[PDB]
Assembly symmetry: C4
């Protein structure tokens, strides 16, 4: 019954289109939730889309000023992958920061809400609140904003608390059926860890996070489910996946330290290793969240100084808006597949023709077959949309 993820990783030549919600285009006519920070997590049968709602729909007076990150009205929305967030969507918890797990038996939802300086993380398993923890650093308590990983019934979630531009207290929480059985402080050379994209790498869990303080390379967290040991490093690929960053010719990376190159900010992204190579996704624009591309870097997991990429796919065209991206793993007949979602942010603080901020999602899954090219942007025309 419990998921162990003991199958090997599927061979990947690239990624094929999997799902698209068209949320903003459907919002022009119809009642669609205002969302941001989405992710995808699958039970053994089907996949689900999650998002942090803003307590309002897009064609709504309350969609004004929905660029704010933390409000009391934010809830975690949960639909089947493909079903857009309409008025029949279930909100499973109060959360302006979220992470969701299926251990093979039931869903685990990790939900953070409340005051910025005194925040509660609620742990809801099988529809019941099982445990809760208060912010330890008395700062903005935040979690992965993506799917977490359960192996043998033990789910791991990464939680950060403290300064976003300085030393912060990151904890790895071990949850069994909604109950916190252990809490390990982050160890290793990753100095700043935030919004980890975690995937099962049996016998443990590997997380690729964002360094929001001093690195454009992505921190790596390796979690051993049995021993509970934590080790930290950075993605060694010379092509860094964080935005902002330097250009490919000028960007540099380090196997153990942040590269100190346009690292003061960041975006949620993902990466996974295929032997010594790394499969990564990032925004095409080096400074803004415009476009999205995925590629494989040869020896990009074991060698800094490697800027040799291949199998590049354009997910979102460079002229179109992207946002958070994360990984999620789907068990196959014989192997574990790696899939990723891209959040397509539209609205305020970058497009001022509307008063709201919302997102769409495009989902791609790894394939061992062949694929073509294309681009799958949000596609809404905000000049004609209600304000």
């Amino acid at each position: 019954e419990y998921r162990n993820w003991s199958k090997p990783q599927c061979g990947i030549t690239g990624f094929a289109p999997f799902s698209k919600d068209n949320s903003i285009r459907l919002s022009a006519g119809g009642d669609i939730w205002v969302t941001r920070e989405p992710y995808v997590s699958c039970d053994p049968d089907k996949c689900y889309q999650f998002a942090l709602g803003q307590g309002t729909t897009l064609n709504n007076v309350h969609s004004n000023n929905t660029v704010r990150d933390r409000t009391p009205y934010r809830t975690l929305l949960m639909n089947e992958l493909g079903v857009p967030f309409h008025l029949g969507t279930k909100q499973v918890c109060i959360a302006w920061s979220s992470s969701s797990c299926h251990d093979g038996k039931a869903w685990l939802h990790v939900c953070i809400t409340g005051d910025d300086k005194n925040a509660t993380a609620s742990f809801i398993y099988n529809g019941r609140l099982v445990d809760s923890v208060v912010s330890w650093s008395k700062d903005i308590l935040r979690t992965q904003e993506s799917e977490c990983v359960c192996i043998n019934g033990t789910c791991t979630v990464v939680m950060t608390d403290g300064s976003a531009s300085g030393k912060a207290d990151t904890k790895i929480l071990f949850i069994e059926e909604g109950k916190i059985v252990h809490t390990s402080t982050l160890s290793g050379s990753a100095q700043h860890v935030e919004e980890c994209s975690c995937y099962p790498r049996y016998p443990g869990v590997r997380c690729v996070c964002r360094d929001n303080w001093k690195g454009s390379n992505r921190p790596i967290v390796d979690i051993n489910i049995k021993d509970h040991s934590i080790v930290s490093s950075y993605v060694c690929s010379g092509l860094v996946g964080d935005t902002p960053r330097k250009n490919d010719s000028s960007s540099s990376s380090h196997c153990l330290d942040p590269n100190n190159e346009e690292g003061g900010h960041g975006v949620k992204g993902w990466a996974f290793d295929d032997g010594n190579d790394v499969w990564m996704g990032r925004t095409i624009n080096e400074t803004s969240r415009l476009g999205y591309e995925t590629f494989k870097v040869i020896e990009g997991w074991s060698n800094p100084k490697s800027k040799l990429q291949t199998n590049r796919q354009v997910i979102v065209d460079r002229g179109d808006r992207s946002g958070y991206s994360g990984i999620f793993s789907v068990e196959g007949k014989s192997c574990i597949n790696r899939c990723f979602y891209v959040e397509l942010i539209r609205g305020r603080k970058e497009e001022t023709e509307v008063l709201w901020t919302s997102n769409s999602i495009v989902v791609f899954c790894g394939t061992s077959g062949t694929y073509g090219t294309g681009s799958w942007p949000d596609g809404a025309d905000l000049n004609l949309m209600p304000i």
Copy 2:
């Protein structure tokens, strides 16, 4: 198969956020039922939200004059906890007063509708009408407006018939698979019992009710599911839970009689005992349904005169609107958890910029862990909402 509730009560240090519907905020764009008197009740798998609809949506001509409590068009709406009352919501019965039960096998709905002087209580178990009873006092027959409790197949419901300002005929009905197998009149020191927040306290059921006549101290009712024996008293804490009430310094309780302190009105509320202590919720405002706080009174269940607060939590900010609150119990892996919901009333008779009266809910569940602070109001701005 039949829920017994024989597990002990979970150790509670407070309550963690559980659910929020944002009903009024979603009403501004989208078709949402006009509801009042909500409550939460869970089958052994997931929790459900209930409310008494007004036969209309909010952006509707029929949402005017919806402050009225008893209309022929009121129905009991039932969704999964989290799903807002959209047009796909199932109205399970006709009722302007309702109570719902799950005994572990099927749902029991107690639904009261009809003429105020001659009302019918229909008992629907497993989707069928199994029994019905007429008013005995030929006055407004009313029930809990919250979850009832079923132990070993037998569900107990408190029903009141008579004046809200003088002796009323309160009966406890024992229902097995929808059939009324016993009816016992209320006996004990509580003289006005209405809208009882009942919870399982094995081997019995304990209800904390509203005295609309002479009390600010909430009445208590204890049912022996075995001897169909009913005992009545009041809550002993010197910090009373009813609204209106006196200051915290000037208030008193007797917990064998009403305190005769500003007791000429009331609001549905909850309290449960933790040894000699009492966990209780109330409005922060002593005169109006503004704000909501929960706290634990030291020896507040046994010592009239205890006013020692601890573990206070602000659920709704004092400036924000609250309403009915009630308790519901969720079975855990080793203990029984106590959770509560707060109805957030918005609209007429207190906010005259709209013509409708409706509510959202916020749900909190007892936690043995830690939590922070916050406030989770309705959040809808009625100045911009359709009138």
Copy 3:
């Protein structure tokens, strides 16, 4: 697995409120189907509501001229009892005349559509067309517009083909798993048989129909499931149940023939026997479909002269609009319960304030307990409703 209906009839002292959809009231804000001729049928777990949609919602340009009975766009809508016919409602077949069956294993739908003089009846069982029959009299082929009855896997449906103002070819069709295994021409003294309300009277099926030709007393069709025998008579009760009819002073019934009293025209209605007594429902208004009452006539199933009324209930107030009414049976724990629905027609012809014709439904179920009084009309204000 197959339903036999072998239990006796539950002792009925009257009827208690069961369900109310508030369709027209919710139509003012929200997308609700335009329907007419509804009915209720239940599978061994839930009750479903059916209606003949007009291919449009109420707030729609196509709701104009929805007073037409037979259009190519009419489909049979099927929702759970309580869920209003919103946009997510499933239309199970094309039909402007319908009847639905659950034999304990799967749903049977008898759907009539096509030309008025060459109508086609489709038989859909378990989601599949199993059989089809053409109109045999080349006039409006019609069926019960209510639930049909299956015993031991054999469902029986009453179909009429011919004129509404004279003799018509009424046939009784025996259907097994969607397949017509036998077709019996109507036999007996009933001269015009239409829109039968059938209930299981084990070992057979009893149908109370309307005479649209020469009688205000309701015809009876007795169907033997074992022998496929058909027997026809009239409800003997001197208080006739059809509309139009004579006043209670001048009503007469023959118990074998139509009474020749305002018998032209009619409304779909219901009746069932309780020993020698009859439980029947009818419009309060003798000439119009205004109001609804249910009562019991003492010795009304055997004595053509009995006018002794008792146990009268007002379902819809005298000034409010009723419509079609029909019976459906629910298997209880020890007996078979009889329930009835009343269609609440609103709109064109009678109410010229709107351009559409639609309906709401109110459902009552038999009870052995006590009950009060009340009135549950449609309750929509058509002066403010969109036209």
Copy 4:
């Protein structure tokens, strides 16, 4: 658990009405997806309707110029047959060309999206992306736009890549649990094959496709599942089924070569054999997609030159708009039934009073019983609908 379709073909005397969508009529009030190229597939329990959405609803600013066939926002929508494509509809994949299969265990969705010259076909089985293939001719890679057929766990899909007017590369793909196990190049005497309407003809699969280059007669692809052999021919029927075509008096067929009679364009249609006879459907207009008729041709499957017709049914009236039509097979108790759908296109490039292009569907199933006449058009009044 795997569907073998081993039962004989049902004796068919004609077709009976099964399902109607009314999508465009419901679009006037209510949020309904803009769709085109629909089809029907059934699992062992019930039937589902599929359509290629345009990423927008009809009463939407993005509904403008929805006449384009390939956009990044097009997705495959999936509801149960009878549920209109409302906002709760699940889009199961990104596709502007699609084909869907149920093999008895799980759904297989074949979805093509991306650039015109480098389109990607994604193979999604049981909710997971299993395989993927790129365009082989670097042109518009397209598939059946109807249900594919699975036998003994092996599903077969016909894929065309290349010129729409000229020789193109057609491949038959054998898919097992989402994985492409074999790929067969089209062989036989058919020169242009597109949008095949395939049905199980045990022990193989037979497809009736459209010749878009040189023929108004329809090509036939016979697929042997046992040994993956492909043979091709045309339909001998002197009454050809493609639109445009010549009139009945001047048409002809060869069933080894295209008839070279107004074969420059085409429409997706269906045919199946009844011994030596053929049941086919086509537009009543020989040059436009107006009306729809079905009939049987005596010796039409084995004799070019036959023009003898029987059992003609008008599905859509001659002056009403039709579109794509395809076949789907339903397993009965003892026989395999052949059913078909007709797409009712409304909107741009033929009706200029609206800016959108969308469709409704009507479904008919084969019957061994009797049936009447009728016409079941889309029925929306576009002069009154929003742009």
